[PDB]
C-alpha cells in the first residue's frame, strides 16, 4: 500500500466514477434492460443453484455495473451471506454458444490448479467465487423468459466486485482529468509499478495470459490491482488460436498465422501497452482505442502505420517510465524486456523508491 | 501655463504604463516645442505617429491539434469561426507549415497558426528554429484539458534559451461543465478554476521553468474568465510604440477593453492636434473647410470600425440597430440644420462640458474637439451595443 493511496483516490472520485459508469450504460441501454429482465423477470431476487459445491443462493439485483462485448456485469447481493458480488451474464452469439460456455466453465475452474483459497488469499488473480444457474432451468441453454434480440445463457458467473476496471478509469479521466496536484499524479506511478508486479507474478508461475488489457485489470475496494479472465491462462510455450488475443493488443508477430506460441513476451508487450495507456489514455502506434479522445483508427499492427513509439501527446512522464515502456514495447520479441527482469533495472528501482518516498 | 508644459502635462493625466509614446520621445517633443521651430516640432510628432502606425505585430500560437489555436486566433480578430477569413482546424497540421492570419481591420497585427510539434518530426529546439521563434512579439502555447509532454518540452526549451512565452489553457468552460455534471455534490466553479490554475503554475515549477503568464479562458465566452487580463498583460509587455496598433485591434469584449481603447485614442488626438498647430481663436466661433470635413468623416469611420459600430458590424447584428446608437446619424443631411451647424453644436456641448483643454488664448483647431466628441460618442455606442449582445 500503495493500495491505500489508490483506495483513497477512488473514494474521493466516487461520484465522478459513478457518473461515468452510468454514462457508459446509456448507449447499450436496450441490451442492459433486456438482460436485466431475463435474469430478474418478476422478483428482486432470483434463486440460483451452484454448478459446483456451493448449493443454493438468492441473488438480489443492486445495479448494472458494466457492459462487455458478450456480457453484462451486475452488482448483486447475497443477503443471507451479507455479501455483494459482480455477476457476469452472457448473451448468446454464437460467441457464447452452449459448448463455448461449457468450455469456459471447465477452463475457469481448473485455473487454480494451473488451490482456490490460496490463489484467493494471494490477491493477484481475480478468481470467480461460483458459477450458478437459475433454478429449474437447464444450465448453459437459453434462459427464459427470452427477450427479443438478446438471448441470455443460463450460466451466471459470480466474482468479487472490483471498484473500477482500468478501462473505465481511463474513460473517466478522459472525461474529467481529476489529477491536478503533485500528489494526485502518484496514481500513475503506482499503477505503473502495480502493473509490472502483476505481470511479473504471471512470469514467476510460468504462465501466459494474453488478455492483459485494461478491461481485465481491476482496482479492488482495498486499492489492490488484480488481473481477471483466469480461463485464458496457459503454461508458457504452449500453442493456441491466435484469435484469442485481442487484435489491438497483439504484438506484430502474433498477426501472421491462425495458431501461435504463447510466450512471456506476449504479456510483456501487453504490459507495455497498459502502462502507456496509464500515462496516455490512448494506445500507442495510432492503434484504435474506442471511447478515448485523441485515438487514431489503426485496426492492428499489420496495417501500415506509425511504428515508432511516440510520447508527445501523453501526460508528462518521468524518463525512467519512458524507458521501461520502450523496452516492453520492443518489436524484437527475443530482446523484449520481461517483467521479472524489469524489476531489477535501475528504472524500476527508481520508480519504486520515489513512490515509497512520496508515500512515507 | 506655458504650452510645452500643457502638452506634456496631458499625458500625466493618464495611468502610468498606459501611454502611447515613451518619455524619451515626449521629452524630445517638449524640447523642440520650446525651441519654437514649428516645422521641427511638427516633424517629431509626425515621426512618432509614423512609428506607431507602421509597427507590425507578430503573434505565434502553438499547441496540440484541436487545442483551440484557430478558435483563439479568430476570437482575437473578432471573426466568427465560420465567417470569411476565419482560421480553420486541420490545415496547419496537414501542411506542417505556419500560416499567418491578419487582423481584418488592422492588417499590421498578424497571428501565426503554428503546427503542433507532434505534427512535425522536429525536436523542441529544431521546432522553435523552423517556426522562427525569434520573430514573434508573443509566443503563446495553447493547451486544452491537461498538460501534454509536447507542451512542456517546448516550454522547457524556451526556458533554456532564457526566453519567454505565454501559457493559455483553453476550454475551461468544458472543465467547469464536466465538474458540475460529474461531481455536483462538491462542485464550486471558483474552486475548479483555482485548482486548474494551480496545476498550471505548479507544473511549470516542477519542470524547473520560471512561472510564465498563465491564462485560463474559453474561446466560446470571450467576455469571461481570463481573456481581458490576457489582453492587459499582452499590451503591457509590448514596447510602447507597438501598443496602439494592438490595442485598437482588440475585440470589444468588455466595457474595460472599450474604455482603455478610448484613453489611447485620446492621446493620439492630442498628438494630432499639436502636430496641426494650435490657433488663437476659439473653436466655438469657427467652421470647417471641405478638407477638414473629409478628414472628420474618415476619422468617424475609423473610430466606428475600431469600436465595432461600423455599418458592416451593424449588419452582422439593420435600421433597427442603427437606431440604437448615435454615430450612424451624424452625417445624415437634413433641412433642419447643415453639417456645419450640427458640428458647431457638438463643439458647444464638448467645450461647455470639458473646456478648451489649454491655457487661455490658445486652442486646438476645431476639428480636434470634434474628434474628441466623436470618440466619446462611438465608445458609448460600442458599450450600448455590447449590452444588447450581452
Ligand atoms: N467549449 C470550448 N470549445 C472550444 C474552445 N476552443 C476551441 N473549441 C472547440 O474545440 C475544437 C477544436 O478547436 P480548434 O480551434 O479548431 O483547434 P485547433 O486545431 O487548435 O485549431 C473546435 O470544435 C472548437 O469549436 C473553448 O474554449 N471552449
Ligand atoms: N468482477 C468484476 N467487477 C467489476 N467489473 C467487472 C468484473 N468482471 C468484469 N467486469 C467488467 O465488465 C465488463 C465486461 O467484462 P468482460 O470480462 O470484459 O466481458 P466481455 O467478454 O463481454 O468483454 C468489463 O468492463 C469488465 O471490466
Ligand atoms: Mg472483455
Contacts of B153 in chain A (CB under 8 A): 312
Q: Is A107 helix (H, G, I), strand (E, B) or coil?
A: helix
Q: For residue B356, say if its preceding peptide bond is cis, omega within 30 degrees of 0.
A: no
| CATH architecture group of domain A22-161 | 2-Layer Sandwich (3.30)
In the block, residue with C-alpha cell 505548479:
B202
Q: How far, in Å, is the centroid of ligand 3 from the Cα of A144?
A: 25
Give domain limits for chain B. Answer: 1-55+239-390, 56-238
Contact B202 A181 (CB under 8 A): yes
A349 contacts A341 by C-beta, under 8 angstroms: no
Contact A15 B196 (CB under 8 A): no
Experimental method: X-ray
Q: Is A47 helix (H, G, I), strand (E, B) or coil?
A: strand
Q: How many CB atoms lie within 10 A of CB A121?
A: 8
Q: Please list the residues that pair with A83 across neighbouring strands.
A: A78
Contacts of B64 in chain A (CB under 8 A): 313
Query: What length does chain B have?
Result: 390
Q: Residues before each break in chain A (C–N > 2.5 Å)?
A: 114
- Ligand minimally distant from the alpha carbon of residue B220: 1
Resolution (A): 1.7
A323 burial via Cβ count (<10 Å: 0-12, 13-18, 19+): middle
Sort strands A217-219 and A225-227 into parallel, antiparallel or unpaired: antiparallel
Q: How far, in Å, is the centroid of ligand 3 from the Cα of B184?
A: 31
Which of B317, B279, B273 lies closest to B295 in space, CA to CA?
Answer: B273
Residue B68 at interface with chain A, using a CB cutoff of 8 Å: no
Residue A177 at interface with chain B, using a CB cutoff of 8 Å: yes
Give domain limits for chain A. Answer: 1-21+162-360, 22-161
> If you compute the radius of gyration of chain B from its CA atoms, what whole number of angstroms results?
24
DSSP assignment of A27-45 equals: TTHHHHHHHHHHHSSSSSE
Q: How many CB atoms lie within 10 A of CB A106?
A: 11
CA distances, B164 to each of A90, B100, B124, B210 (Å): 58, 21, 15, 9
Look up residue A253 and give its three cell numbers: 508477430
**Measured distance CA(A32)–CA(A18) in Å, rounded:** 17
A144 contacts A37 by C-beta, under 8 angstroms: no
Q: How many CB atoms lie within 10 A of CB B23?
A: 12
**Measured distance CA(A161)–CA(A85) in Å, rounded:** 5
Which of B342, B155, B371 lies closest to B262 in space, CA to CA?
Answer: B371
Q: In chain B, which residue's Cα lies nearest the Cα of A172?
A: B182
Query: Phi/psi of residue A62, each to 5°?
Result: -95, -60
Contacts of B207 in chain A (CB under 8 A): 316
B122 contacts B176 by C-beta, under 8 angstroms: no
DSSP assignment of B132-165 equals: TGGG-SEEEEEEESS--HHHHHHHHHHHHTT---
3-state helix, strand, coil in chain A (%, to 5): 40, 20, 40
- Decide whether any atom of ligand 1 lies within 6 Å of the B89 Cβ: yes
CA distances, A238 to each of A103, A242, A257, A339, B340 (Å): 18, 12, 15, 20, 101
Sort strands A152-159 and A83-91 into parallel, antiparallel or unpaired: antiparallel
Q: In chain B, which residue's Cα lies nearest the Cα of A280?
A: B148
Given B182, B199, B207, which is nearest A175 (Cβ)? B182
**Measured distance CA(B189)–CA(B179) in Å, rounded:** 8
Q: Which superfamily does CATH assign the domain made up of B56-238 to?
A: P-loop containing nucleotide triphosphate hydrolases (3.40.50.300)
Give, in words, the CATH class of A1-21+162-360.
mainly alpha
Given A16, A313, A315, which is nearest B182 (Cβ)? A16
Amino acid at each position: 500500500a500503495g493500495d491505500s493511496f489508490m483506495r483513497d483516490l477512488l473514494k474521493r472520485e466516487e461520484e465522478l466514477i459513478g457518473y461515468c459508469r452510468e454514462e457508459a450504460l446509456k448507449e447499450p441501454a436496450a441490451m442492459v434492460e433486456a438482460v436485466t429482465a431475463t435474469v430478474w423477470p418478476q422478483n428482486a431476487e432470483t434463486t440460483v443453484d451452484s454448478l459446483l459445491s456451493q448449493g443454493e443462493r438468492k441473488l438480489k439485483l443492486v445495479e448494472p455495473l458494466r457492459v462487455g462485448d458478450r456480457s453484462v456485469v451486475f452488482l448483486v447481493r447475497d443477503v443471507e451471506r451479507l455479501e455483494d458480488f459482480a455477476l457476469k451474464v452472457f448473451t448468446m452469439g454464437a460467441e457464447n454458444s452452449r459448448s463455448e460456455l461449457e468450455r469456459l466453465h471447465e477452463a475457469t475452474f481448473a485455473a487454480a490448479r494451473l488451490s482456490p483459497e490460496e490463489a484467493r488469499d494471494r490477491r493477484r488473480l481475480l478468481l470467480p467465487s461460483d458459477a450458478v444457474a437459475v433454478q429449474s432451468q437447464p444450465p448453459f441453454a437459453q434462459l427464459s423468459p427470452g427477450q427479443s434480440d438478446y438471448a441470455v445463457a443460463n450460466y451466471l458467473l459470480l466474482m468479487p466486485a472490483a471498484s473500477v476496471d482500468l478501462e473505465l478509469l481511463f474513460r473517466t479521466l478522459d472525461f474529467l482529468y481529476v489529477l491536478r496536484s503533485t500528489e494526485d499524479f502518484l496514481a500513475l506511478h503506482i499503477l505503473t509499478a502495480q502493473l509490472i508486479r502483476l505481470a511479473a507474478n504471471l512470469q514467476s508461475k510460468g504462465l501466459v495470459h494474453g488478455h492483459f488489457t485494461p478491461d481485465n485489470l481491476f482496482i479492488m475496494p482495498d486499492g489492490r490491482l488484480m488481473l481477471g479472465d483466469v480461463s485464458v491462462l496457459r503454461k508458457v510455450g504452449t500453442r493456441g488460436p491466435a484469435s484469442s488475443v485481442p487484435v489491438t493488443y497483439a504484438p506484430r508477430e502474433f498477426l501472421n498465422a491462425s495458431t501461435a506460441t504463447f510466450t512471456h513476451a506476449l504479456d510483456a508487450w501487453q504490459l507495455g501497452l497498459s502502462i502507456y495507456r496509464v500515462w496516455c489514455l490512448f494506445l500507442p502506434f495510432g492503434l484504435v482505442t474506442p471511447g478515448i479522445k485523441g485515438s487514431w483508427k489503426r485496426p492492428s499492427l499489420r496495417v501500415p502505420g506509425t511504428d515508432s513509439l511516440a510520447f508527445g501527446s501523453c501526460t508528462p512522464l518521468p524518463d525512467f517510465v519512458q524507458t521501461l515502456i520502450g523496452r516492453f514495447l520492443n518489436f524484437d520479441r527475443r530482446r523484449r524486456l520481461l517483467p521479472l527482469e524489469a524489476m531489477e533495472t535501475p528504472e524500476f528501482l527508481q520508480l519504486q523508491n520515489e513512490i515509497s518516498s512520496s508515500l512515507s | 501655463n506655458d504650452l510645452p508644459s500643457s502638452f506634456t502635462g496631458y499625458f500625466k493625466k493618464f495611468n502610468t504604463g498606459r501611454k502611447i509614446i515613451s518619455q524619451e520621445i515626449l521629452n524630445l517633443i517638449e524640447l523642440r516645442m520650446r525651441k519654437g521651430n514649428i516645422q521641427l516640432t511638427n516633424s517629431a510628432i509626425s515621426d512618432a505617429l509614423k512609428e506607431i502606425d507602421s509597427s507590425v505585430l507578430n503573434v505565434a500560437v502553438t499547441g496540440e491539434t484541436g487545442s483551440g489555436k484557430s478558435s483563439f486566433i479568430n476570437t482575437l480578430r473578432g471573426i466568427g469561426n465560420e465567417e470569411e477569413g476565419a482560421a480553420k482546424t486541420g490545415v496547419v497540421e496537414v501542411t506542417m507549415e505556419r500560416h499567418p492570419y491578419k487582423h481584418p481591420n488592422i492588417p499590421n497585427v498578424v497571428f501565426w497558426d503554428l503546427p503542433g510539434i507532434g505534427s512535425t518530426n522536429f525536436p523542441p529546439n529544431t521546432y522553435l528554429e523552423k517556426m522562427k521563434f525569434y520573430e514573434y512579439d508573443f509566443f503563446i502555447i495553447i493547451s486544452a484539458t491537461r498538460f501534454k509532454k509536447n507542451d512542456i518540452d517546448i516550454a522547457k526549451a524556451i526556458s533554456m534559451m532564457k526566453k519567454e512565452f505565454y501559457f493559455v489553457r483553453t476550454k475551461v468552460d468544458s472543465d467547469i461543465t464536466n465538474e458540475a455534471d460529474g461531481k455536483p455534490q462538491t462542485f464550486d466553479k471558483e474552486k475548479v478554476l483555482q485548482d486548474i490554475r494551480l496545476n498550471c503554475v505548479n507544473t511549470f515549477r516542477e519542470n524547473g521553468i520560471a512561472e510564465p503568464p498563465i491564462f485560463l479562458l474559453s474561446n466560446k465566452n470571450v467576455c469571461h474568465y481570463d481573456f481581458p487580463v490576457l489582453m492587459d498583460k499582452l499590451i503591457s509587455d509590448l514596447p510602447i510604440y507597438k501598443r496602439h496598433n494592438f490595442m485598437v485591434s482588440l475585440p470589444n469584449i468588455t466595457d474595460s477593453v472599450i474604455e482603455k481603447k478610448r484613453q489611447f485614442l485620446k492621446q493620439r488626438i492630442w498628438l494630432e492636434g499639436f502636430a496641426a498647430d494650435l490657433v488663437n481663436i476659439i473653436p466655438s466661433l469657427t467652421f470647417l473647410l471641405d478638407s477638414d470635413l473629409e478628414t472628420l468623416k474618415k476619422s468617424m469611420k475609423f473610430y466606428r470600425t475600431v469600436f465595432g459600430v461600423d455599418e458592416t458590424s451593424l449588419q452582422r447584428l439593420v435600421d433597427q440597430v442603427e437606431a440604437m446608437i448615435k454615430s450612424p446619424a451624424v452625417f445624415k443631411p437634413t433641412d433642419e440644420e447643415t453639417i456645419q451647424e450640427r458640428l458647431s453644436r457638438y463643439i458647444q456641448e464638448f467645450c461647455l462640458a470639458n473646456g478648451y483643454l489649454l491655457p487661455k488664448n490658445s486652442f486646438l483647431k476645431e476639428i480636434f474637439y470634434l474628434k474628441y466628441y466623436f470618440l466619446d460618442m462611438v465608445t458609448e455606442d460600442a458599450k450600448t451595443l455590447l449590452k444588447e449582445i450581452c
